[PDB]
Structures are given as C-alpha cells and as structure tokens.
Amino acid sequence: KNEPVLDIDGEELRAGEQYYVVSAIWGPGGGGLALGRLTDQKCPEIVVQRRSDSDYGTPVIFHNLDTKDDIVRLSTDFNVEFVPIRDRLCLTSTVWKIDDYDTSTGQWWVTTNGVIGNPGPQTLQSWFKIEKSGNLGYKFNFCPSVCESCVTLCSDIGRYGDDGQIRLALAERGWPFVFKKAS
Amino acid sequence: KNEPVLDIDGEELRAGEQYYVVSAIWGPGGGGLALGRLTDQKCPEIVVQRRSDSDYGTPVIFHNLDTKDDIVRLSTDFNVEFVPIRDRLCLTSTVWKIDDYDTSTGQWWVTTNGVIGNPGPQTLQSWFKIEKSGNLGYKFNFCPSVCESCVTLCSDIGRYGDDGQIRLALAERGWPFVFKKASS
Known part of the structure; x- marks a missing residue:
C-alpha cells in the first residue's frame, strides 16, 4: 500500500486522531494552522497559519477514503477537519474545502464548511492529499481522484497573505508541514 | 448538541469504548447482543441476542458521525461495531448494517459487513440511531440523516425469530436495551 505519513514522533498518522499541522520552517516561517476568521466576516471560518512558531494552532482530524484503512497515506485523497478547543463561533463545518474562485485576490482559498x-x-x-516536500516534511495537495469524469484543479497548497493574516491557497509551490500529536 | 445516551451507571456513553448491549427486559426478554451465524451462511455474521439474561454477548463500539464528539447522543447517526472476544472467522466487518430485503421472511435484517x-x-x-424507551432503556432506530437527497427506510429495530435464533430487524416498535461498560 502507499507509504504512510508519519508524525514528528515517526509514528504513522492514524485517521480519527488529532494532530497539529505545524510549519516545517519555524521562526519567520510561522507556526501551525488554525481555524481562523476574516476580520470582516466571522463565518464560515477560514484556514490560517499562526505567525508565531510555538503557536501550533488548531488540531485537525483526518478521514480516510478507504474506511477499512486506519493509516493516512501519501498521495491518497482524504477529508480534513479542524477540532476547535473553544465553543463554536459558527454553525458551518470545520471541514477544509477549496473555495469558489476569489475574484478580489485571484486565489483559490482553503476555507471551511466542507x-x-x-x-x-x-x-x-x-478532498485533499499529502505528498513529500523535497526533503523537509510534508506538503498538502488538492488534486482529487474521487470523480473520474470531473474536470478538477490539481495544485499544491501554499500560503498567501490576505487580510493581514497568512491564509492557505492553491499555489505553484507547496508550503511544508510536519504533524505533531495533539491531546 | 442532543441529549446523551447513558449507561446503567448513569454515565454518558463514550464513543470508542466497549459496551455490552443488554436487553432491558430480562427472563423471556433474554440477554445481550452478539455476533451470530446462520446454517445457510457462515459469513457475513449476523446480529443475534443471547437468550439467557446472564449472557451479555459480544461487546460493541460506537463510532459517532461526528468524530469530534466523544459522546453518543440520542437521535444522532452512529456506526456500531462488534468487538469480538474470539478471533474473526469471517474477514467481513463486524459493523452493523441493514441487509437487503429478505423475500423469504418479509424482514429487513440487521446483519454485519457494514x-x-x-x-x-x-x-x-x-447508520443507526438510539431513541429513548422509557427512563431506564434505549431502543435502536434506523432512519439515517447522512444523505439528505436519499429516500430511506425509517423504523425502530425489534427482534424476530429466524433459524432457531433471535435476530434484530426493522419493526414497528423497538426493543429496549441498556448499556454496560465492558471493562466493568
């Protein structure tokens, strides 16, 4: 089967368990991903990256395409969902999805309500995938295979400034991340 | 957001943990639910009820529709998986599902390989739900909400004799069970 994604402990990623998604580049490279919100719109929430490298953000849970396989594997479609520690501020889902095209920025954003x-x-x-990123950790990719007849975007997921925050979007160059177990 | 399901100790049912599903009616109401098999079918395994009120049967684990919620709640879709004590003879899943309609019995059976x-x-x-059956018991119900556009069966789960055994099937009124922590 496809090679498993590993957390920073070297343990295989398990679907249904909570992980922080943390920038593999610390310092000026920032911290982990988080359930964010636009300054002018509180819902649906968006995916942002915290600017401080010790702020791991909000944990996520992965949901495998192959229900009988407990391991999150490279180059394999999955759902990802934030697990907020605070009471919900929105009724939309915390599941990642690619947004409708944003004419005001030219970006295909990673947002929630998936x-x-x-x-x-x-x-x-x-539906998202994880691929190796050079030799520095892992990279998110949006290129679904769940609909063989569908025309789809196929692109790495990078970071991009918006609204004074660091958001995630389809991009030529994917930003690298590592996975840390979350209690 | 809904009301939690409670075990016999008054504690909220925890998704992921092993619980016996024991009939709230003892004596001729029998005991707990278990993996079974038929004469004409070794695999997949079927859902049966042990006939002795001291037999709690095979422990189950509840998988919430929402993995973020650690609690099994009422009127909320979940998956049910038998956690066998003995090793699996069948490689089909121990997960409950509603079978295809059985023309020989008129029944929509609860089987496995879900x-x-x-x-x-x-x-x-x-996908199954739990509803209240009084104040100490809980009934199973099949009426999934996971597919808004789907036409679906929608009915309580009761018991029905088949093959000399007690099986579960869709029925107009549901059989009441209680939940007992298996570690206890």
Whole structure:
C-alpha cells in the first residue's frame, strides 16, 4: 500500500486522531494552522497559519477514503477537519474545502464548511492529499481522484497573505508541514 | 448538541469504548447482543441476542458521525461495531448494517459487513440511531440523516425469530436495551 505519513514522533498518522499541522520552517516561517476568521466576516471560518512558531494552532482530524484503512497515506485523497478547543463561533463545518474562485485576490482559498464523506462530484472540493516536500516534511495537495469524469484543479497548497493574516491557497509551490500529536 | 445516551451507571456513553448491549427486559426478554451465524451462511455474521439474561454477548463500539464528539447522543447517526472476544472467522466487518430485503421472511435484517464512517449515500445502510424507551432503556432506530437527497427506510429495530435464533430487524416498535461498560 502507499507509504504512510508519519508524525514528528515517526509514528504513522492514524485517521480519527488529532494532530497539529505545524510549519516545517519555524521562526519567520510561522507556526501551525488554525481555524481562523476574516476580520470582516466571522463565518464560515477560514484556514490560517499562526505567525508565531510555538503557536501550533488548531488540531485537525483526518478521514480516510478507504474506511477499512486506519493509516493516512501519501498521495491518497482524504477529508480534513479542524477540532476547535473553544465553543463554536459558527454553525458551518470545520471541514477544509477549496473555495469558489476569489475574484478580489485571484486565489483559490482553503476555507471551511466542507463535507466529510461521499467521494464523488458532490464533494469534490473537500478532498485533499499529502505528498513529500523535497526533503523537509510534508506538503498538502488538492488534486482529487474521487470523480473520474470531473474536470478538477490539481495544485499544491501554499500560503498567501490576505487580510493581514497568512491564509492557505492553491499555489505553484507547496508550503511544508510536519504533524505533531495533539491531546 | 442532543441529549446523551447513558449507561446503567448513569454515565454518558463514550464513543470508542466497549459496551455490552443488554436487553432491558430480562427472563423471556433474554440477554445481550452478539455476533451470530446462520446454517445457510457462515459469513457475513449476523446480529443475534443471547437468550439467557446472564449472557451479555459480544461487546460493541460506537463510532459517532461526528468524530469530534466523544459522546453518543440520542437521535444522532452512529456506526456500531462488534468487538469480538474470539478471533474473526469471517474477514467481513463486524459493523452493523441493514441487509437487503429478505423475500423469504418479509424482514429487513440487521446483519454485519457494514462500513465505519464515509457518511453519505454509499454507507446509508450502516447508520443507526438510539431513541429513548422509557427512563431506564434505549431502543435502536434506523432512519439515517447522512444523505439528505436519499429516500430511506425509517423504523425502530425489534427482534424476530429466524433459524432457531433471535435476530434484530426493522419493526414497528423497538426493543429496549441498556448499556454496560465492558471493562466493568
């Protein structure tokens, strides 16, 4: 089977367990990903990266395409969902999805209100993959295979400034991350 | 957000943990639920009820629709997986699902080889709910909400004799169970 993604402990990523997604480049490279919100719009929440490298952000849970496989594997479609530690401020889901195109910035954002499950055309924008990033950790990729007939975007996920925050978006060069177990 | 399901100790049912599912009616109401098999079918395994009220049967684990919620709640879709004490003879799953209609009996049986997670049309038959049956008991119900566009069966789960054994099937009124922590 496909090679497993590993956390910083070298342990295989397990679907359903909570992990921080932390920049593999610390210092000026910032910290972990978090359930963010635009200054002018509080819902749906967006995916942002904390600017301080010790702020790991909000943990995520992975949901495997292959339900019988407990391991999150490279180059394999999955759903990702934030697990907020605070009470919800929105009723939208915390599941990552690619947004509709943003004409005001030229970006295809990673935002929330995605859908867990039902791989196919209805849920195309909610399926992500992890690939190796050079020799420095791991990289998110949006290139779903869940709908063989669908035309889809295929691109790495990078970071991009917006609203005085660091958001995630489709980009030529993917930003590298490591995975740390979260209690 | 809904009301939690409680075990016999008054404690909220924890997703992920092993619980016996024991009939709230003892004596001729029998005991707990268990993996079974038929004469005409070794695999997949079926859902049966042990007939002795001292037999708690096979422990189960509840998988919430929402993995972020550590609590099994009422009127909320979940998956149920038997955690066998003995080793698996069948390699099919121990996850409950509603079978295809059985023309020989008129029954929609609760069997196994269901699927954990992947909420939506592909797993519709694997989602179950718990409803109140009085004040000390809980009834199983099949009426999934995971696929808004799907037409679905919607019915309580009761018991029905088949093959000399007690099976579970869709029925107009549901059988009441209590939940007992298996570690205890």
